[PDB]
Structure formats: C-alpha cells, structure tokens
C-alpha cells in the first residue's frame, strides 16, 4: 500500500543550470489536505522547462521541474472532493484557485495561486514533498512532473475522461491548450482573417491550429527552420517563410505580403527579436499581436509607444486564456469525440529514463514533441 | 463673392519651432474637386498643436495649425455632394475615405488618408492651398483651422445639425471626442470596473466622462496639479490623486488602492514616465492599459514583456476610436439632444486675435479648454 506513507520513486533532479537531467532516487511525502498525489503516466517536453535549464527563466534550485502531463490519482489528503484515487488527471501549471480576483474573473485565468511570476519552487502551503540524497527539492509551476510521482495542489489539478490515452492527452496540459487558445480565446482570430505565426514548435503549431478553427484565410508561418514547414501546411498554414531567406527585415516582408500587415501575430519563440518583429508585422491600425513566447529574464524590449496610438492591441497570456481547471476537461472531451488530433505534433516516444536524449531532440530541432512514457 | 476665388483673409502662423504664433494676410485658394473651403467659427486649442510649437511633434513649417474646430462651409470643389455652402461642419483631424481597408474594418478608424503617420503639411492630393508673403504654407493634419478661411479634403469635414452652437461643439472636433471614446469604444469600460486616469485636461476630463458613462464604479483622477481635481469629481471621477504627495511609485499606490490595479488605465498626457506607471497600474491579469497621449518624438519606452505575457492588454488609439465622418455628427446629436454637457471643458473664450494669450493659458495651467472665435 502507499497510501498515508513516503514514496520512494525515481525522478529527474536538475541540481544545477546547464547541466543534464539526473534521474535520482527520491522520496515523496504523502499528500496534505487539499493536496493530490499523482502516478504519473506521461510527460510531454515543452521549451519551458528547457528555459530552467539555460538559464533563460528563474525558479529556485535544485528541481523538478515538468509541467505538461497525465497521470492516475494515487491517493488523495483530506478536504479533497473533486479527485479521488483511480482517476485520470492532468496537472495544471496555472491553477484555478475559483476564489480570487482573476479566477472570479470571466475574461482573465492567471490566477494569483500561480508559482510563476515569482517561483517560490514549492506547494501552496509554502512547503516542498521532495527530498532526495538528504536534501529537499523543489516543486516547479506546482507540478513538477518529470517524476514518477508528484503533490499538486487539489486546484492545479483535472479530472478527465476516464478513458482517455494518457500518452496523447498529456499535450492539452500546456503545449495545445496554450497555442490553440492563444488564438481562439486571446487574440480572437476573426474568420476571413490574416494571421502570422512565430514558431513552429508545439506550441506555435498548436496556434497554427487554432487560427484555422477559428476561420483564418491566411495563416503565414514563420520559423529558421524549415524542417518544420510541412507539419505547419498540415495543420494549415497556407504560407511558411524562413526569415534567413530574405534581405530586409521580416516585419517588412510581412507587411509587404498582406497589404500592410497581419490582422493577428503571435510570437510563440520566446525572444525579443521576433517579439518585436511579431508586433511590427500586424497592421498599425487593425493589428492585434499576442505575445506566447517566455522571453529571457528580465531582458526588455525597447518600443516606441506611436507604434500602439495608430490603433494596434498588444498582449500576451498563459495558457491560451483557458482557465486552467474548467478547460482541460472540456478540450479532453473535444479531443475523444476527435474534434482535432495531436498525433502530428507527437513525433518520438522515450522511456522517462532517457529524458535528457529528450531534451538533445528539441535542442536538435529535429522534434517537435516528444512525450516520455513511465 | 468669394466661390471660385482665391480668398484673403487672416490666419496663425507658426514660423518657426519655440516661436509664438503670427497674425498674418494669407491667401487661400479655391477648394480642388472633393475639397470644402470653410470659414471657420470657433477653435479649441488641443495640446496637439502645442506639441507642434514645442518641437514635440514634427511637421513641415511654415505652417498654420488647428484641428478642434467647427465652421460653415463657403463653398465646395466639384464632385463635392456631402455638405454645400452654408452647411455647419466640423473638419477631421483623422478622415474616413470610406474606401481604405481600415475604413472598411469596423474596428478600426486611423484612415490610410491620414498626415500624421508621416506628415507631408498638404491635402490628400500633396499639394497646398495656403500662401503667405509670397511662399506656400503647410497644412497640419488636412485642416489648419487657426485661419479664418480653410480648405479641407471632403472625407475630412463632417455635417452637423444646424442648430449646433459653433462655440461648444467644436471641442467634438478632438478632445472630448478622443477622451470619450477611449473609454467607450478603445477600452470598453465595463460596467462596475475600475479605472485609472492620468491627465486632467480636456482630453483627460472627457475621459473621466467616458468611464463614467461606461458605469465605472471607481474612477481615479491622477493629475500631478490639484487645481483641475474640482472638475474631475465634477465629471465622474470618485478619487484624484496627486503623484506628488506620495514617496512610493504611483503605480505601487494605485495597485494598493485597488485589489492588485486597475481593470482599465488611460495616459493622457504625452509622457513615458507616466505611460509606463499607467501599464503597470492596471491588474496583471486582466488590466487594459489605454494609450491616448501623443508621447515626444523617436522617444522608447523599455517593456519588460512579461508585464503583458501574466493578461495585460496594452492598445492605443487616434480619436477615441470613432470613425470620423459618421461619429462626429452622431456625438454632436447626442449633445444636441442634452445627453451631454461640454460646459464644464470650456474654461476661457477668447477671439482668434488672441491666439498667443489661450496659448499661455495652456501653459499656465489655468485652463481646460480654451476656444477662439473667429
Ligand atoms: N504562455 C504560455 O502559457 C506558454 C505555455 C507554454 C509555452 N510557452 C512558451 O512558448 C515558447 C515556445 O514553446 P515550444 O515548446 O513550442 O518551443 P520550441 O523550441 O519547441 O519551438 C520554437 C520554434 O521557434 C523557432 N525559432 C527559434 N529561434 C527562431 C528565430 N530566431 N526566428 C524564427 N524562428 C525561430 C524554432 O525553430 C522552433 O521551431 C517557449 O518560449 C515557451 O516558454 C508559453
Ligand atoms: N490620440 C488622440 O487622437 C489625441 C487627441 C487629442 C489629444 N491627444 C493627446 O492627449 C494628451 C492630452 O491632451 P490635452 O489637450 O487634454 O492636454 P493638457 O496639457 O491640457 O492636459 C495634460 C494634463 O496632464 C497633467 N499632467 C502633465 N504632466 C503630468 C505628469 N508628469 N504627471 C501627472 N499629470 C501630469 C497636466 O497637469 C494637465 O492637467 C496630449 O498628448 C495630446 O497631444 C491625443
Ligand atoms: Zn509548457
Ligand atoms: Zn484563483
Ligand atoms: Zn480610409
Ligand atoms: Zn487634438
């Protein structure tokens, strides 16, 4: 039994930045109240965690980080009613509290539970359930689910579809749900529209995905990479271009190819560069941008405000405006009844033990998403 | 008769930056096909023109100034058929060619017709109707109204009601109309919300009256001069504050008086300093920050991005979002049937003769709104 007990499990520790992932043996307190204790299933690697990795986002170390998966309910603590053991769930790297400002909120879902715009590394207590090697570990976005066991908050975590493929569905905890509502809940793609993606991983494809549901006529992807341009036609982009294939700037080519701009850009890379060039190519006066991308630490931008007074909208999210806890069942459900597939955005499939290959692919470019299995 | 001749008569020009304004004979030709020679009536002076003066705002000089204005049309080139001689009308700083793809967008009003982008002094055809002491004269934003007799592209001069009282109406022309319509139609207030608005002047009253009508439950005045917090309670406003009274940040105090910041902010003043308070007061997560000051030029605001990637909606807009030609008669019928004052932005009326002195005013900071009547 585990049940009201420590576990004793593997997981992947990054003791420090720009190292390799170690997979460790580490001990896991039982859940507190209002706390659920989650047998992972399947992980997906999404460039945030990586971010912790380069340096490029800060959380408090060592950790475990890992944020987009699925799981079955292992045990519950007390206070919990909306999951109990067997269940299938997803964690959430955003929470959905429903009792703050945002979360009460109809038009915002970042609610003020997040461990994100100061990382503490830990539950909502304040408090880590990871030691390992004698040490405490802490948690990351709240999730921490390159594990083979994790604690979630009871608010950061979903109940769904009990007969749900846990290796698939694992996507809808951030990689889809993020893309594809940046599109249809953020930015609001209008049908007839003009759109243009930046970045073609599995978040900017997933974004490529929600500009074509939403009705798009034009959907221009943009990326270095042109490896990634067939899988973008796919999932329907009707144009892809390579910025290293042209002499004048991007944001000019843009413009230059739409009558004067996109009606929505979304920058889904996380650099000042092409957030900036993302602003610069949706139209002056009917342009909306949408910022997707986590940019590098406290690295700023440098604009000049005549660029919004025309009549651009500029803005950004997290998790594609889904309030977390509300949406992933939903778009779990949407998925089952085959409203939309993820198989194209899952191209390898590795054990958890080879993890740090994982991350070498999207180093590589040569994935896309590649889920670990437990 | 004056029609199909050239027309001499006074108007205000500005030689040089930094210089006061010159009484002088100018000449005015007839109006080209599609274009209104108006004798004007009464002019507000707008902060807009000032910046001019300043060297805030580049413009080709010699050049005659004036946007806020209202007049009656004295004739009319071929192919006119929307107003005739005698008509009352208000010029646009902002046209509405009707035929443009932002015209024909219903979000969206900045007109491809338009000279402040990148302000060539002319009308639409790229030439000048103005004369003085031998030498041509610029145009500023197609309408230089401190002229007793101006010549204005047809989609740049809307017909009002006419039994509209000249000397008030005319503040419709700009402030209260861009003000408002920030309000109304940029940032849709929403009923109950809470708002934050930086600057007291006539544009920034009109904004505090925008928020009002929207049924903002909180308005907050911020105006570093505590003269002009009379008329913003007057208007709406359900607080003012005063940046200097306080040792911390303004942002910091708005976001304490309010839960974590406001849902909708305005600049209307025309500085970074206070554009980027006015981005950081309104709530992370589901904060609108409005931008409807003209800032300095080439001047950069630095944005760390993740001050929009947490919900921030950052946008910016020219004449409160109102399509020109078909807002500004609706505006003006809507004050005709008493549904708004203007009374309380007029604080001092002056003839044209004495432009200098409604300049000084400005200045001085003794007045809201000064008109000029011809
Ligand atoms: N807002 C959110 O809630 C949220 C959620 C998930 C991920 N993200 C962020 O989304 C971003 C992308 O995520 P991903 O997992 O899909 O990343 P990814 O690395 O898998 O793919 C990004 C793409 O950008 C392309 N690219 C990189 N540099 C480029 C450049 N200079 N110009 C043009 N294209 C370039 C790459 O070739 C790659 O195809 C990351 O920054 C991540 O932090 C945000
Ligand atoms: N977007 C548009 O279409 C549009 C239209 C009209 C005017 N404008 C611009 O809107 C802005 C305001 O116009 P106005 O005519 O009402 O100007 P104004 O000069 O009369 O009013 C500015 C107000 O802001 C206050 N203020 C100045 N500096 C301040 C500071 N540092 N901190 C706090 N308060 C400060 C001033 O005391 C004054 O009360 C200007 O930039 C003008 O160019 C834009
Ligand atoms: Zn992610
Ligand atoms: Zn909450
Ligand atoms: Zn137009
Ligand atoms: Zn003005």
Redesign the interface.
């Known amino acids: 039994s585990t049940a009201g007990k420590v576990i004793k499990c593997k997981a992947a520790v990054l003791w420090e930045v720009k190292k390799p992932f170690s997979i460790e043996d580490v001990e896991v307190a039982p859940p507190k109240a209002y706390e659920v204790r989650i047998k992972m299933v399947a992980v997906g690697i999404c460039r945030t965690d990586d971010h912790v990795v380069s340096g490029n986002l800060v959380t408090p170390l060592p950790v475990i980080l890992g944020h987009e998966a699925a799981g079955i309910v292992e045990s519950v603590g007390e206070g919990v009613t909306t999951v109990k053991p067997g269940d299938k769930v997803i964690p959430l790297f955003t929470p959905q509290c429903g009792k703050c ?2 979360c009460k ?1 109809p ?4 609610c ?1 539970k997040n461990d994100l ?1 100061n990382p503490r590394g830990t539950l909502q207590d304040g408090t880590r359930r990871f030691t390992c090697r004698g040490k405490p570990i802490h948690h990351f976005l709240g999730t921490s689910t390159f594990s083979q066991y994790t604690v979630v908050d009871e608010n950061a975590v979903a109940k769904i579809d009990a007969a749900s493929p846990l290796e698939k569905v694992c996507l809808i905890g951030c990689g889809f749900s993020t893309g594809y509502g940046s599109a249809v809940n953020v930015a609001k793609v209008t049908p007839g529209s003009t759109c243009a993606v930046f970045g073609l991983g599995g978040v900017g494809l997933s974004a490529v995905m929600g500009c074509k549901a939403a009705g798009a006529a034009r959907i221009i992807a943009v990326d270095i990479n042109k490896d990634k341009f067939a899988k973008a036609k796919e999932l329907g982009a009707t144009e892809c271009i390579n910025p290293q294939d042209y002499k004048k700037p991007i944001q000019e080519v843009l413009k230059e190819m739409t ?2 701009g996109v009606d929505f850009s979304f920058e889904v890379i996380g650099r ?1 560069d092409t ?1 900036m060039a993302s602003l610069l190519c949706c ?4 342009g909306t941008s949408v ?1 997707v991308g ?2 590098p630490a ?21 998790y594609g ?1 889904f309030k977390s806890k509300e949406g992933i069942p939903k778009l779990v459900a949407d998925f089952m009844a085959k409203k939309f597939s993820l198989d194209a955005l899952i191209t390898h499939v590795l054990p958890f033990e080879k993890i740090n290959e994982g991350f070498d692919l999207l180093h590589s470019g040569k994935s896309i998403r590649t889920v670990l299995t437990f």
């Open positions: 400002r945002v909120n038009e915002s879902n970042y003020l715009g009558d004067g000042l957030m139209h002056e006066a009917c910022i986590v940019p406290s690295q700023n931008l440098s604009i000049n405000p005549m660029l919004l007074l025309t009549g651009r909208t500029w803005k950004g999210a997290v405006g």
